[PDB]
Each structure stands twice: as structure tokens, then as C-alpha cells.
DNA sequence: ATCAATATCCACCTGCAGATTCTACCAATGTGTATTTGGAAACTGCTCCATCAAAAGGCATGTTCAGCTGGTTCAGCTGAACATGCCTTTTGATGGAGCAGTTTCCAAATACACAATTGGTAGAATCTGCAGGTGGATATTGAT
DNA sequence: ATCAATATCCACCTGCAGATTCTACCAATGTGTATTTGGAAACTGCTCCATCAAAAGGCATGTTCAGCTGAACCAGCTGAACATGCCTTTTGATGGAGCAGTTTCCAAATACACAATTGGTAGAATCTGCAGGTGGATATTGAT
């Protein structure tokens, strides 16, 4: 497989196919789906990392949506990227306005 | 009048999660208005998709295509 | 009963998952979230690539285009590190061939 | 007996509810409301249970978020209380309202 | 080197609507750009609808469900109509 | 009729729109009904805007429509305003509008 | 001599400026500000005059708009007066910050 | 192979009155003292962003000159679309 | 403070189902042909940058005081807290079939290509709107 | 009031060029072959919908009173208005070429097709997390 050739877990074949049948453009170079399945692998890894640490924090082995939501909204660059995105079963970052706190 | 099935305590809880302390009286009704607009819009679209699809049943994917149109993108239901 | 073939990323995401946290798992819901994530991101990057093609009047999507797409789409450090993983995997596939 | 000051059970409620992710609105009234709102666009339709759930997640998302932004608007007025003019301000800026 | 624009057709339609009125270059730029933004919007939506429904082809039917999605209200109505009308006159002849 | 706009009775070219739909990669195959219905919808919205801006230019006592007129025309109308919500108009100006509580008492 | 009360020349100004479409920011200091912001991004650039104008339009638009939403925020505070905590609420709700 | 002047804090060329006028046209009456500096802060953020993207486009294009279309693709990217310069 | 009472926190365990490991099926996804997109080099000319002096128009800067900000108080009342009382949401259940989704046939609809021809372009010519100006009527603001 | 005075509003005019019209050159844009998409009909089955019956849990309704809101008032002061003095922007002018965009050639790179084989799917099985809960650890909240 081409992922083995490029050292990825992510299929470069499947992404070659998707770039062809989405009509993004006529000709998809051979380097494109590689670079790309790589970039997705990286960001998948990134999210899984931060979410995993968050998952060990609440003392669970299984990552549940709440963990992911936390990881994303907590990280800054990821949070920017996922701004318009609503994560199912997410919850919010527990945060209270200071001036409603009992004085 | 199913619009009242959105109970006062549901909206109270929703505001709780939103980080709110004290809720006015009118708010509930005002909420109920907003909520409707939202749903009206989204579903309007979702349903359109279902009609293009010549299907009689609205599927989660129609919902998602609509939400993506609205700029409200949703993850976790088959996007 | 009968089967209907569906397509998803949950397997490659298990792989990558096991790479990062060997001792940790992932629920169904969360896996749906990742599947969606990859898909949205994908569509985003490829969309922008496409626009770059047409902007520059070109019939082909080169990795070069994937790249300029990622610089546009991704914020800051994330951008720098993705451009790395990509250029990297492509040079490795290049010499391998 | 025992009575907590006004506002305390609020704060404990806030911590408690912000910390979970579960669906706050009763699902059936919501489902009725969705089927109604859909009746008027097209009659005799069916709903995947997953699609209703999907909408519920979308709407509770919408509203909690709008509330964050509301609370911030009333807090802009040196007030702890959210009101209809606050919500109309939020929507008015987001572009939602004219 | 030849460039392509809608300025001639937007002259046409202007004269249809107000015979005695004219239009400046900047303004024409606004229009040409406008038509184009719209084009990409609808055609895009049509396209997305294709791949949503696994169809390799963009029928007038898709443009239509696009125009229903993209256009708000009365505008959507008068437009879907002006179209159906144009396609139907086109079909017979 | 020879040309296709003539055949469907339009001022907007149905041919050029066929060309653009094809060499834009929206999809593999572009039906014969699509660029028709489309050059129709573009024609229609072009027409609505031009009407509203033209009336607005007559209101300010001028023969030529200038961007300020278009800006007006779009923003006064409720539906054109929603559609062009995120769009900024070159040389546009704003809707003359002052807040009440800033007005003299 | 003659002196107008505080606020009269304010309203005469609002009317006057809302009524026109010409560029409020002088073009040269804006052009230096654009060539500077690009200098330090990629060095040695050239700018089509139209690109300068396009930017000017985009930015004055952004800002006029932001000021409206600011005003609506300060008026919500029962104030005739705008302040940075206002502007920052505007941007905070729009999502920018 | 021929010099430039150096460019430094041209951000103050956005004069107080340009910011006052831009504020009028926004329907504003009384402007605090602080606002000017803060305006600029915001304006800068804006430009940085837009121009970043515009230049990225000019860089993909192997051109040394930024064109209106590049600007426009950028603004359209940010969700800020501009009409009249060639979209 | 120092002091009680609900409410919450965490500890331990156990079982339930949903995560995870294994099985066999199967349909997507290396070499060879033919074509063409665009990278490269060679040239043309547009327009972008630099600079300058003069014109002037707007910026800056300081004084002065008006009305706007927020600090303070203070009454009414509008929401919160808490109990009791009422009802419908939840769940599990089975049954019924609406209809979504999968397959096979196959023809109506478009891709593809060559040769024709005309609408759409640019360039040039020109002319009518109106930008710029000035005076002069009128309308508004603030002073008495 | 009544009154000047600053500013805006409104009309003609006058000259300039930008809209707009004439013109000729030219490149996108009627008929026949070839391929396959989806419409259409035929069957299978997934899960969606109905009404239903218990189990509480949540909503509702009310009483009682706390503190939040806003009306109202007052002192300080911060931002408006105005002139004058100065600076830097605008204009257009020219000159110079960086370099954008247009052209022509040559190949490295990808699409197309046939043919083969294994990663990736669903379905089945099994098993390890953690939900659910109960009971004291331990943290606040309100009253002393």
C-alpha cells in the first residue's frame, strides 16, 4: 500500500479516489492525496492526543465526546479551527462569570 | 400548542448551563420565539433536501446538510 | 440477513489512537465525532485546493496546492506542523516511489 | 427549617449542569414540536430517531450559546439578570436579527 | 487580451427595466461581481446536492432545489417560477 | 430563433452559462436544462436589483445609477438585504440612520 | 462669537458623513500601513493600485460596521458614550475575540 | 539593488480624525479617549489577517505583485465578500 | 471566627452491555498505452514606484466649560427557594407495514468531435451628465 | 417669545471626461456517433410509528421574603468645540523598468484500460470498562 510507502495509517488510496470523485478538479496529481492523508492523520493524531490526556484526567480509559469537546475548546489553535462547530454530547467548559460569584 | 412542551424548567436549565444566575419573567416566551425561528429555518432546509431526494422520510443527513448550510456545523451524526 | 457496505475512518483512527495512547480507548459516539472531523476537514482543504486551481486556471490539483490550502485554512503552529508532516510523507513516498 | 439564600442553588445548579453533557429538554415535547414545525412545510413525513436527536443537539447548542452571550450582555449593564432586550441585542449583533 | 463579462447583458436588462436611465462603470463592476457571486453560490449548492444524492449529473431540477435553498422567500418563488417558465419554453422549440 | 437565449427568450446567455458550469468542475455531466433555468434565475435577480436601484436613482434626481444607489436599493429591500447580508459594496455608503436616545430632547 | 453646545456638531457630523460614500481615511497613511503590514510578511512586494483600494474599502467597511454594533452596545448600557469595554463586547459576541 | 526607506509604526497615520469620521458614519455621538488606540488595535488585527491570506494567494501564484483579485479571494475567504473590484 | 445541617464527594463492588478481537467474504483498488497540461525560456509592454514642487486642506494642539459618567441612596417588587400536589414523560413491548434501499433492464439524454459562422470583444470616436463652484433663499441653534 | 448668525440646502452654469455608440476583427460557439446515467419497475427488509400500561420523576402551583432593579440626585471631570499654526497629504508629472502576462516548444506526469489479489467490510462472539448505587468522607452554607 502507498501509506506503507509513506508511513501512514491513513489510506492514501481512498483519498486519491475521493479527490477524483468529488469533482474538485480534473486531474489529481499522485502527490496530493499523500500529503493530504498525511495532514488528516496529523490532525487526527493531535486531537486524539489532547483528548486522551483529558480522558486520563477524569480517570477513564474510554474517550467519550465530552473529553473531545474539552480538549478542543481548551486548546487554542484547535478551538479557532472548530469555531462554527458544535460537538454532539459536548457540554461547555465549566466557566462562571466572576461578578455573579458571591462576594 | 406543542411549543409549550418546552417547559419553563427546561429553559431554566438551559440558561443554567449557559452560565446564568437570574432569569426575568418575559424571557421564557422570548426564548420560545427564538427557538422556533431556528427550527423553522433549519427544518425548512432539511425538508427541502428530503424533497430533492424524493424521499418521504427525513434522515439525519438532511438535518446535517441543513445545519452546515446555516453555518452551524454538527459533528457526530454521520457527516 | 443481508449486508450493505458502508465506509468509515474508525479503523485508521484506532491505529493512530493506539500510536498516541497505547493504553486508552474510544467510544462509539466519539468515533463518530472523529469520522465527521476528518470528513469536514477533508472537504475544507480539498475545497480550497479546488478554488486555487480555478483561480490559477489549472486543470490539476498538485500536492503543492494541498499545501497552500493548508497554510490558508490552518491557524498558526498547527499550520507549520501540518505542512511538515505532509512535505515529509511526500518526500518519503518520492524516494520510495 | 432550612432555606438557602436566593441565588445559591443557582450557582450550584450552574456548576452541576455545566459539568454534564446530557440533553436538558424533554425529548418527546421536542419531538412533537419538530413534527409540528415540519407538518407545515410538508405533510405526512417520517423522522429517523437519529435525526430528531441531531436536531435536539443542534438546538440545545444554539440556546446555551445564545445564553452565554446574553448573560454577557446583561453583565455589560451592571446587571445579574438577563432580559428580552439582552437577547434581542445578542441576536441583533450576531446578524441573526435585522 | 480578451476578457469576458456580463456588462452587455446587464445593459440589456437595465434598458428593459428603465428605458431612460444609465449606469456607471464602478456600478457595473458591482453588478458583474454580483451575478458571479450568485452563480458560484447556486451552482455550488447544486453540485453539493448531486454528490449528496450520488448523481453524476446536474439537472435543471438541481439548480431549482438550490434556488429554493439559497433564495429567501418571495424572491425564491418568483425566481423558481421565472426559471421553470424559461426551461419549459426552451423544451418545446 | 438560433441562439439559445432567443429560444428561451432571455437576455442572459445560456451558452456561456453552460460553458462555466462545465469548466468549473461542479460535476461530470451538465444537463441541458440546467444552464437554461440558471441563466433565467441570474437574469431575474439582476432585474430585481436594477429596478430597485433605478427607482432609487430617480429619487435622488439622476440619470446614471451609481454604487451608492445600489447599496441603498439592496439595503432598503428586506429580502435583497438578507441575501447580500455578508456582502460589502464598493463605494456603498450607509443607510442614513440615527439612534433615538442620541437625538436632542 | 458663536459656540455650539456639546453634541450639536456631533449630530450635524453624523448626518453629513452618513450621507456620502467617499473614503474617510487618507489614502497615503493607509497605503503605508498596508505596505508595512505586508513588508514584514513577505519582503519586497508590489501592489496593484486597485488592491490598495479594495483593502481600504474592506477595512473601512469592517470598522464602520463594528462602530455601529459598538454604539448599540453602549446604548444598551444607558450611555451616549462608547468605550473599549464596549468595542470588546461587540467583537466578543461576533466571535472575533 | 536599490534602497527603500524603512517603514515603522505607520499605524499612527490612521489619524484621530479618520477614526472620528469612521465613528460618525457608524451613528456614534460621544467617543471615549481610549477608543483611538483600541480602534487601531482592532484594525491591525483585521488587516494582518486579510493581507496574510491575500499574500499567500500571491505566493501560490508565483507573482511578486499583489492584485485586487488576491485581495478579493482573501476577503471572500474571511467571509467578508467585496463587490466591485472583480469578484 | 465557631458552630451545626444538608449537600456533595469518593470509596468500594458488581454486573451489563457495548467496546474489542476474530472470521471469512469480496469488491475496490501494477503494469502498460496514449495524450496533454503546464513548467521553462524567450519577449513585450503595462502600470507601479519614485520623486518633486506647489497648493491647501486637514491635522495637531491648547484653552475652556457643558453635560455626560458613575457614585450614592433607597423603595418597591419581582424572581428564587421550598415544600406539597398533580400528570405525562419515559421505557419496555410487540406488532404492522410504510418505505428506504438494492438490483436488473435499457433507452433517452449528454459527452465527444469536426467544420461553420456570428455575437461579443476591444479600440476608437463623441457627447451628454454632472462634478465643482457660487450665490442666495431658508432653516436651526443658541443667545438675549 | 424675539433675535441674529452659522450652516445647509437648492438652482443654475460651465467645462471635462466618462458613459456610450460606431466599427471591424475573431474565437467560442449545427449535426452525427458513442457511452452510460438514472429513470423505472420489481422485491426485500429495516426501523419507524402506534397505542398501551406501569413506574416515578419532573413539572406545576403556591406561599413567603430577599436582594436586585431603576428612579432620582449630585460632584467631579472628561471629551466637544473652536480657533489658529503648522505639516503632510494630494496631484500630475515624468521617467524607468520590474515584471506580468502572452506565446511557443518538449516531456514528464497523469488518465485510461485490463487484470489480479488482499485490506477493509459486516457479523458474530466475548469480555472488560464503568454506570449505578449505597453509605460515610468532606466540603459549604447559614446561623450563632
Numbering used by the authors:
A (entry chain G): 16 to 118
B (entry chain B): 24 to 102
C (entry chain H): 29 to 125
D (entry chain A): 38 to 135
E (entry chain D): 32 to 124
F (entry chain C): 14 to 118
G (entry chain E): 38 to 134
H (entry chain F): 16 to 102
Task: Provide the authors' original text about this structure.
by the nucleotide excision repair (NER) pathway. octamer, including two copies each of H2A, H2B, H3, and H413. thus operate in the context of chromatin. recognizes 6–4PP lesions in the context of chromatin.
